[PDB]
Amino acid sequence: SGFRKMAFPSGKVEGCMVQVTCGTTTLNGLWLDDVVYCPRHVICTSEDMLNPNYEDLLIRKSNHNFLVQAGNVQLRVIGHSMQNCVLKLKVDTANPKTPKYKFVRIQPGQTFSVLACYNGSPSGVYQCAMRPNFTIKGSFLNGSCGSVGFNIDYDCVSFCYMHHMELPTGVHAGTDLEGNFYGPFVDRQTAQAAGTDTTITVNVLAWLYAAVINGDRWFLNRFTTTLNDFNLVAMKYNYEPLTQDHVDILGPLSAQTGIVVLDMCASLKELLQNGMNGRTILGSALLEDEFTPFDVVRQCSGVTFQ
Amino acid sequence: SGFRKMAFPSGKVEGCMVQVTCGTTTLNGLWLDDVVYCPRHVICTSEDMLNPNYEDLLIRKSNHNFLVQAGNVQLRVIGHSMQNCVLKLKVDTANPKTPKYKFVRIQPGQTFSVLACYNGSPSGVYQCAMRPNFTIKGSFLNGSCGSVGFNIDYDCVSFCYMHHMELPTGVHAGTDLEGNFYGPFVDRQTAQAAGTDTTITVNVLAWLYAAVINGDRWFLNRFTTTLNDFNLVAMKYNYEPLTQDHVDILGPLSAQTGIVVLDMCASLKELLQNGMNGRTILGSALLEDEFTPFDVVRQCSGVTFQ
């Protein structure tokens, strides 16, 4: 019993993190087999980041300008290439600690764990969510670029995110491991508008189910609602519209707790309209939206990995 | 920038977790050199846990009743012994993945990371704090006993906690790795009163400093206070009394932000007396007390390990 914002065991990913240095810029890279992945702005200086011609900047470099550090191992660089916004450095040694992995482009509202790294050394591990506006609300100090987000399914690591940028608003943007940014952001130091961020409604509902499972009882009322009627209250408070697909996502949690999904929607409607009156739900005074329904089922069942 | 409840990289500890089976009970053990550490109630059945004579139960066992599983490695057990509330199983093979480690008895208000495990397989990683009443508010489903809490200082793992028990109130109790319980709890299935839990005042203040560092501005007022006058408001709201030692703990954070510690105390006094008016502080609508001042300095400086 009890419910925590729990991140994946980062051991599999710790063994892949390296240090990539190009000229006078040092960030993190990811070492999978004989390829190192890292943000392409490692080739930029501070002045370059305002309007960088990444192609032109890359011709000025050859393989021997990239110094890759895995602890104290020297990786020789035998080839380099740009794929969208990431660099792929061919190294002559396959990583002996490479786990089975996938590259996955995640959808908004999904969650993943972040291994914050600096100079190739792991610092901390925390969970976050891909906000509906494709940003993430993490902790990324100077030198954290190249840190990766991931999920684990038993023995396989699913890499979904690599950090690139701190927006001038304080939120964080990055790419998948094919180099494509999530959202409209570009690896350039300019004004970048982040769209309106809505609350992930299906995640809040799943977190309400985890509270009922763990004894938080007080917010279930005697009301019910319809999909279109709850969706009316949704846009009022900038919540994501609930679809039938979201209802079926919550199917298993509805089965165990015996509370119909639309009845849980009525409890959410009353929480949005009436506030929380100073009470808490799983140690929280807000409505939490960083738990996917798959996250709730995992913690409430003891699913492990390896 | 940004501030997260961040746990240590659990790779060093993942390589020490094993599965310990005695009769029909299966929990987790910790494999350091040629010794496996695990809770002593692995030798109990469900009926035994109400009034177990652990000594008498241990004579009925010999070395070949303990089946230790590290992934698919079979560890032979060549000796067993009780130290307080933990079992020490001598195995004939030293763990090749043993990091440098210490056993540490932590003080209340300190924080550590928890690697939740089931049947010897890591499930998740999260940070928590030793509450002033020596409980912890974690997530421990059935089969999580033996999971350990730890801190990392560069290359050395400081083991401080191993989980033993879920109280009938839903909170969690356990021991240090010498087998001594934190608090008055006993590995027995009975009514166990948990004392009044106060809020860790020095941790809330340090979390207020991290908010100022990261732009949360609104709660700093034009008031100041004294130690005894703030301590008056402390016991009203069940906060820990602040001592001069706590003030000096916050010294470095007072130096960087330029806000005197007692001025931050005045801001806390106004937050306790006036509520929060519906605003947030680092994405939180309550006053967070699970961040030690050493935790704040780490995240705000980029301290890494290995």
Numbering used by the authors:
A (entry chain A), B (entry chain A): 1 to 306
From the paper:
SARS-CoV-2 Mpro is a cysteine protease that forms a dimer composed of two protomers. Each protomer comprises the chymotrypsin and 3C-like peptidase domains I and II (residues 10–99 and 100–182, respectively), with the active site consisting of a Cys145-His41 catalytic dyad located in the cleft between the two antiparallel-β-barrel domains. Mpro cleaves the polyproteins at 11 positions with a consensus cleavage sequence Leu Gln | (Ser, Ala, Gly) to release nsp’s, which are required to assemble the viral replication-transcription complex. In addition to the indispensable role in viral replication, SARS-CoV-2 Mpro also plays an essential role in escaping antiviral defense by cleaving host cell proteins.
Crystal structures of 11 Mpro mutants provided structural insight into their altered functionality. We employed crystallographic structural analysis together with a high fidelity FRET activity assay by our group to assess the functional and structural changes in Mpro mutants. The crystal structures of several variants revealed the changes in side chains orientations of residues in the active site comprising substrate binding pockets, especially S2 and S4, which might lead to altered amino acids preferences. Accordingly, changes in KM values for most of variants were observed, indicating alterations in a mode of substrate binding. We observe the highest level of conformational plasticity around the S2′ and S3′ binding pockets with N142 and S46 being the most flexible residues within the structures we solved. Also, we observed that the charge distribution in the active site changes quite dramatically even upon a single substitution especially around the S3′ and S2 binding pockets. This might explain why with most mutants we see the changes in binding affinities and not the kcat values.
